[PDB]
Design a protein around this ligand. Structure first.
Ligand SMILES: Nc1ncnc2c1ncn2[C@@H]1O[C@H](COP(=O)(O)OP(=O)(O)O)[C@@H](O)[C@H]1O
Ligand SMILES: CC(=O)N[C@H](CCC(=O)O)C(=O)O
Ligand SMILES: [Mg+2]
Length: 245
């Protein structure tokens, strides 16, 4: 126990944060726990694309993103999701800060496959030293799912991918992938537990589809690298538990 938890918050999930959620965060912070928050915003980016007349195309659960598209992506993530997260937490007495210009000094990335996906990135390195300044200061850093190429270009990163990189870089005790379903569902009920060795065969039988594909792959990659537990569900405490074994 390093006493470190990474919380990743999905698009819908960030717009419905409960009283239980807000108290649990404040109580962990008051008990000395070190907390880092990562968030996405697919539902918001989709809305914005419509309102601005661009076509949503995804491939393998990843959004095809042109350079013009990135203006839309960064606006929805920073101004339409991230600012609300920071305001709800501060109003509840949690000490925290949205990264904006600090993003380029923390998350390095490269193009996943330019010809297929455009400006979609894969994380290449996390600079721990600047996340550590916030934590040493008892303040929770809030990170949108964005990174920067070696040449300085902003890239769109699937939020689950960013959460794995962050949890692994800090050697976290636990990662929570909080979303808008109660667990990973199979045959009409929530699965209580799954090990990393069983994930591939549920993506092969297509039990798991769409956005739950990058979610469950990130969970498996995290425990495989030594993080003790990953939770997938709609809250901080109950849902599906994933372990290396
Ligand atoms: N086996 C499954 N169990 C649960 N959800 C699934 C499954 N297969 C596909 N999904 C879909 O994955 C979605 C969650 O991923 P996503 O839509 O990207 O949410 P988030 O914004 O939290 O990342 C669920 O809302 C559900 O529609
Ligand atoms: C929707 C969307 O563009 N997703 C991301 C980033 C946001 C999120 O994960 O919620 C992506 O495909 O790369
Ligand atoms: Mg998603």
């Amino acid at each position: 126990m390093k006493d470190i938890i990474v919380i990743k918050i999905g698009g819908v999930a960030s717009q419905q944060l409960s009283g239980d959620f807000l108290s649990q965060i404040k109580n962990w912070q008051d008990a000395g726990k070190q907390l880092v928050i990562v968030h996405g915003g697919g539902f918001a980016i989709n809305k914005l694309m419509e309102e601005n007349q661009v076509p949503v195309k995804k491939i393998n659960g990843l959004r095809v993103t042109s350079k013009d598209d990135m203006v839309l992506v960064s606006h929805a993530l920073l101004d339409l999701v991230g600012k609300n997260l920071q305001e709800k937490l501060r109003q509840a007495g949690v000490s925290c800060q949205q990264l904006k210009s600090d993003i380029k000094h923390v998350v390095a990335a490269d193009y996943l496959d330019k010809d297929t996906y455009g400006y979609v990135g894969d994380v290449t390195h996390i600079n721990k030293r600047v996340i550590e300044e916030f934590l040493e200061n008892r303040q929770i850093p809030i990170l949108a799912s964005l990174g920067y190429s070696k040449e300085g270009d902003m890239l769109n990163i699937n939020a689950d991918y960013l959460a794995t990189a962050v949890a692994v870089a800090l050697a976290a005790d636990k990662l929570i992938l909080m979303t808008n379903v109660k667990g990973v569902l199979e045959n009409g009920a929530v699965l209580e537990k799954i090990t990393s060795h069983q994930v591939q065969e549920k993506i092969d039988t297509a039990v798991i589809t769409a956005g739950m594909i990058p979610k469950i792959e990130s969970a498996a990659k995290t425990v495989a690298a030594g993080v003790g537990q990953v939770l997938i569900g709609d809250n901080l405490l109950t849902g599906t538990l994933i372990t290396a074994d």
